[PDB]
Amino acid sequence: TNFPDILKPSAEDIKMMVACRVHIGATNLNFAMEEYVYERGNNNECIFNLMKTWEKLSLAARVIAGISNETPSDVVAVAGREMAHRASLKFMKYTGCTAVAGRFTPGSFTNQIQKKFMEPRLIIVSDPSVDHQALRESGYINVPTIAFCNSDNSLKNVDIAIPCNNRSRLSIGLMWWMLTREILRYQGKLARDEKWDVMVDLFLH
Amino acid sequence: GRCLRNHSITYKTPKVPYERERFDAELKLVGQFGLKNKKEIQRVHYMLGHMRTIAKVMLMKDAKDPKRLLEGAALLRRLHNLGILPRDQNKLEFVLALKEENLLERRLQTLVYRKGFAKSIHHARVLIRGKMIKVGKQVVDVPSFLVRVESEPLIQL
């Protein structure tokens, strides 16, 4: 049907997410992220539902895969925080999606006269709190956005939010690693029954 | 009130005395019909506005209303003999779509032109005002005669 049986998260993927404490979030909880939160931890911190993390993860990858399966350059992956610069750069390498590495110059989606003016159809941001500028420019160009939101961030101008830890070095690299692998699986360029050659340590900062 | 014989106004002046967009449009017709002054344009405009008000009021009622059937046909009947409204248009909606050229094109000065008696529309006035023209059995010298459909083929010297 719509979520076939080949799409359960294999035990390898769950094993690494708990290892990289992806489920571990912040303390202040946004109201819009209460559904993904399963329970509060021992020192009053949010613990994301791992299944809810994966189901949104694949759904985001499916949307990217469809758009990027004919026009790879029409996807832009912005990543403000210095931690997520390497992982955002490898995501560009293995899918062809453009990826703004460091600071996002305001008006790079609205000013056509600019030399570095790109007009995408999908935007992926590493952190809505750091990359609020990129999200706000979407509301001028009718472009849907996807964010690796955390339990405290504001879900303004984000359509698909992946509940995961976007501050730790391991989780930042791991989630981008899963998104790239899932995208390739949907593309058909990577069999679902094999193991991806590139290890997570490549994405790590 | 003091007098017993009724009186009425045939025209109204425009609300805005000075418009350039109106001086050209009104002078377009004066040349096209050789009218004496701007009173004729207002009179024709006043005449049309009365019929448009009957249809406008009557379109707000039901089709089975007794007044709609009776008064509605009466207005269409009256227009049909005058010939302002084409016969094939027999609904009250088409009354609202009438213009100010329909009424002015049935005037005697217009009719004698297109029938060919008068070379120029300024020349038609002298022939009309001189009683040279005749309508059926009666001599006419008022250039404003709104001829009917029956009297259309009965215009001779």
Binding site: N2, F3, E55, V63, G139, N142, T145, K156, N157, D159 | -
Partner: protein, 81 residues
Amino acid sequence: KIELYIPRHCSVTHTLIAADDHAAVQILVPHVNENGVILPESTVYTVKGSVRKDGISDHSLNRQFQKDGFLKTVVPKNMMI
């Protein structure tokens, strides 16, 4: 024809989309086969501009995605209407 066009209808609020609305989006979710590879067929979701700027687009879509079957248990039972 009388209409200039037939305006889109937002999938979230079931309300029209303005021609000047520059915050509205259009999310396409391609269908996947039994192997797990996308297909050229897709379903289109439209979200109005004002919905996005509130923090509601993400939760509202999950109601629609779960109803259409692209998600299984993201949204709880008592939150589906």
